[PDB]
Symmetry: D5
Subunit: 186 residues, 10 copies
């Protein structure tokens, strides 16, 4: 898998809050990032997923997490989608266009027979290492609240070497401190 591997350099145009910009791996350095891939603009499941992420974007930014949604459509298409759909209109993060498919292939996420990216999400830490991955079938929407829980645990372990987050962990709950004595006792 790509788990625990460094993301690859990339260069893409994106639509973000009314303007076109260029995004590269340099923009991710030193930051937590979420690469949110979806099949295509103007579809059915994708907007509700992108809307869901938008509903948690202020919390993600406060956590120092940037979000980049990615599809194989052009940034021009994203711009138009943003103007015509009310749920896409609330998006204030960068919507990356990946028409050559290089960003999508970098994440091993292209459905070759369709020219579209699969429904996948990648959490990337400040050193660019992928810490959590989620991929679902075409007809199955993702859940932003699950993404957030995983991000908080990833941030928690980064700040607490020697500790690990048990299943279901949430801020305030007990963690584990790996030791030779704890081996077999849990």
């Amino acid at each position: 898998s790509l788990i625990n591997t460094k993301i690859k350099p990339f260069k893409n145009q994106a639509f973000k809050n009314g303007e076109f910009i260029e995004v590269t791996e340099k923009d991710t350095e030193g930051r937590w990032s979420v690469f949110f891939f979806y099949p295509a603009d103007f579809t059915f499941v994708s907007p509700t997923e992108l809307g869901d992420v938008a509903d948690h974007y202020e919390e993600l930014q406060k956590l120092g997490v940037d979000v980049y949604s990615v599809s194989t459509d052009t940034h021009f298409t994203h711009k138009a989608w943003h103007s015509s759909s009310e749920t896409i209109a609330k998006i204030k993060y960068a919507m990356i266009g990946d028409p050559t498919g290089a960003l999508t292939r970098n994440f091993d996420n292209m459905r070759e027979d369709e020219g579209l990216a699969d429904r996948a999400t990648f959490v990337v830490d400040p050193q660019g290492i992928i810490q959590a991955i989620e991929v679902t079938a075409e007809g199955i929407g993702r859940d932003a609240s699950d993404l957030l829980r995983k991000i908080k645990a990833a941030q928690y372990v980064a700040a607490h070497p020697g500790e690990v987050c048990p299943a279901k962990w949430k801020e305030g709950e007990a963690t584990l401190a790996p030791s030779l004595d704890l081996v077999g006792k849990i």
Copy 2:
């Protein structure tokens, strides 16, 4: 991503409720299956994840879903861990041993430098097609509840061709019906 691909043939020994059994892809045919990979027996995060799934086993069995946990330890080791650990003793699903690492590699889930599988979960349908995937870093435990939501979502899309489950879908909530009129409307 192995999303939307058929699982490959396999034959592994396993430990299940007191005895050793052989498990192959034939056992998965016609059923919903969950392949739950974890790094190693007698560790910290893993036990909590395995117990968490055990807590939902009744629910999963009622959904006609079989659980197969997998690690590169042997089935002998799984039996030993099942005797000495409170949490592991409550496991009633099959614990597959994958010492050759072939099962783990079939799922592109091997940490080659460690000889251990990554923390990955695969939801597989009755036709052997992978419908959902989740992979997390070593120190981040999974949450069985998220898994259950995706499973139900998958079973719903399988039972209702023409319908897809939007973001955060839960049984009882509206679904979407892809059509030409819906394009751009959501």
Copy 3:
């Protein structure tokens, strides 16, 4: 050059007068076809080129010519564009989506560094042979009147073997009857 070569098999989804249909080379056999490639939807020059063609569609149809616009965007995007743009709304011909870029590559017309098709037009006869080709730079708009002239010339030499259309030929003007005596005399 692809001049005088037969078009290759293809299968693509498209938007046409309110509905999504599938187009293959079988749909072009026995008819005159114009493949009209453009970079991307929601752009600037492309809209004018598509409208210009739509302005001549009545004429092209009387001539028994089908038109297929092609871009690497999806058919969903075309539909959204057909609804938000007043000039695109007048397109009554098929708008083919080519997200995998296969069709575009068949016509050797892909700008690989952009994942977008170049501004090219191909006139194909009923036998599937390419009789005319036009390609212009990104910022230069094509002229539909010019396309029509080429089509009529191609249709003339088609129906009148042994006869060829000289420079500036139009419907009704003098043609040439290639013979040994005329050699070197013009």
Copy 4:
């Protein structure tokens, strides 16, 4: 195709206004150039095409555009043809001989089975970049007026970065200015 690519180096013999000269890519550097390929000397369609260009040569020269006709015939043959045909007689631009076919293949315009070049026109800017391409079947003549419209549009875009020419643009007509806001509105 070769759209937006730089022309390759070449060195060929040509007949021009009563004398034999050598033409290389250095001759095109700093100037706008049209490479006009035709199948063969002493034929039928070609004559009317080369003459049509000669009729527009004054205009082309005023626009700083040179013209180079090309066929796989030798320069000797061009000289004889110029001195035996009233139409070819009025040609003042360079008539290049490409007996090795190298120039023709550089432009990917060789009919390998006949050893003759196809009816292709290439508009090359002062930096050697190909900005417009036209290819027609053997029995279809080209129109020099169409060529002039493309050169003017090409020259205009080169002189006005940030501006593009819509379909059917002519000197003095409204041009487009690609903005983020214009996306989807045109």
Copy 5:
């Protein structure tokens, strides 16, 4: 060299006494042939050579010999040259056009850097076997008289197996009858 080898199949367009015909290796079978290669039409040395051969055509036809001149020019060019030159107009044999260079290459006679054939002559017997080869530099004209002496010698050995024509041999002169007795006696 190609001495004593069978010519390869070919299919070219040629000019012969006011008309255009097709020439294949099937037209040579059953007869004596002379393949006369020259650089280019409308030149200097070639006409004198083609004319010289024309001055011996009568004698050759009597000897059942067919002459085919070959250059990389087209058959159209040959027709135009026939008309414009006093010496060329008296050519009654077939003038083959080899624009693809295939025929010239079958005889290993192409000057690759010029795209023109070298000054070479090949004498081929009724079975397609090359019996004599002559090749001279660009500025060295051939002599039809010598061609005839060789044609006669070739025809003599063909009709008199066991006998060979010594140096300088000519019709009605002492030939040689190879035998074990003559070894080292001549």
Copy 6:
């Protein structure tokens, strides 16, 4: 063809006027040379050919032309043949032995199924460039007088740049002076 190419270096043993000498490319530098190949010593046609050349040796030497007869026999064999054949005895030039076939292959003159050289002659100028080539069948003898005309024609054009020898040219006749004005005239 090997026409207009430079001979390759070589180092062979030869028999000349009663002694064994070594001949290399150096020996040809700055001198006109004729490489006279023949199949084998003690044969039939070859003696008469080698004798014919012997008769024109004065004339050739006077013209600054050296003669080298070549066969795949050794130099020992040449001496023996020079001592037993009245005609061979008159040979004053060098008889090269090419047992390895190297020299013969340098001139692309080997009958591979026999290990013997074909009946071929090469005229080489002082710069080592092949200016004339003649090859005949096994049973056909060569005519020295034909060689001299070509040698003279070769020497002429070498000392009269800009001028070319027409067909049948002989010392003391009208040569051609190519130009843009003589194109088509002749």
Copy 7:
């Protein structure tokens, strides 16, 4: 065979007397080493073998020999086994975990179809050279006292260059001094 070859570099985690340590080839430099491979933890023959060795561990240490048991199980497993089994509990040497199977493949001792190491023992001298090898089938336990005999013999020939140990050799008994005179005598 790997007999008389140097061990390859390796890096593994081990369990030793209550703690986890890292072992590499560096740790064996300058000491006699025994690499004791076995199939899997929590099994039947293996425990008795490991215990057999533990019972000889004091004598081995007096001989300056370190012992490393190796299986493809993890070091966590070894710890659990050390706590749960009475015979394993008496092991005071390092228990190496080799989940990648690298150490195992270095010694060409992997049962590829099981992902388990074979029942093999290797004696390695201070310079890392293998001086003795033993491998038995899955069902055949090894005898630690035979190991010791070979170790003592390996140490003897090492400290006495010029002497070899005959069969059945025990400390104190006669040895041989290879000489030319001793050839064929014994």
Copy 8:
């Protein structure tokens, strides 16, 4: 390792009790075999080992075990060695000669830089499966008694399906009956 693999086919000349014979794999089928390799005849350690094996030949024969000693010497050398050596003379089993090194290489036992076999012993059961392997360095002689124990253990397991022999097992001691209940117990 070659453990648990089937021996390959071979054909070698051997010396056995005064005469020369031929041994092949066929001779090992249905019986127990011990392939005893040694470096060279007329040496020091080897004689003592071969003699040791001789001392146990009765015991081995009663056990149904055939013994083949192997070295890269010829069978001629073996005979001569069997005459001049008191120890070798007492050998009554087959002494295989393997000058091509083929038999030795089948058992992966060749010291390539010496052309001599290493000191290795293989125990092969009636089905040709290698059950035990022992290899010692040049100066370390083997012990026949340990071979016997291993053979008896190999025979006991073969004759007692479901049982395995623990460390230090000898006829009359406790064996193990692998079962799920025993996992972790020993």
Copy 9:
């Protein structure tokens, strides 16, 4: 070495008793044959060797042995040499001409840098198997009497299976009988 290998098919021209013949391997089948290679005709050591063999030809023929002398010269040269030399004149066996070098190379006897065969002798039995080989430097002549001792020895072992000829063996002396007693005795 070629010793004990079968000769390869060949077809060469040869001179034998005043006539030219063809020799192939069919000629050698069922007969003892001697292939006598020498560097070149008309030399120095060769005649004496060929003459030496000729002095023994009557004895050889009586023993059913044929002789084929071989050199890379032609059969014509052999004929000439047969007339001019009193020694060669006595040769009654076939003198094979091998101008292509194939026969010589079949016997791995070519001096590549000279194009001449080395001084080698090969004795070939009726089944085409090479039983004796002799090769000497350029200046060392061979001795036919020794060739005769070998032929006789080879014939003896062929007609007396189980018997071998000791060193110096000659018609009449005692031979040896390979067995088991004579091992190490002689």
Copy 10:
């Protein structure tokens, strides 16, 4: 053939007059050497051949010729053979062992299917060049007296440049002085 090639470097153990030594190409530099290959020790023919050579050791030594017998047996076997055979016991030259078959292969003298050298003899000069070769079948013994003749003739041609030894040459007999005049007269 290895005739006229330099011997390759080698390092081998050997038995020489009661002691083992090491022989390398160094030992042959500056001296005449004879390498005598034979199949195997303790055989039948080889003994007589080796003794025959020993009978000529004095002579050979007085000539500055060293002898090295070679077989793929070890030097240990040679020693034992030198002690159990009256005739091998009289050998005073070096008996090289070549169990790796490397020395034997350097002289292209290995019977691959037996692992033994063929009966071959090589005479090497002070510069390490092979001047004479003799190879015989298994059952054909060599003659030392013929070897001696070739050795003397080889020493003569070396110490007398310009002279060669005719067939059957023995010291004190006529030699040949290779020159242009003698060509053909012998």
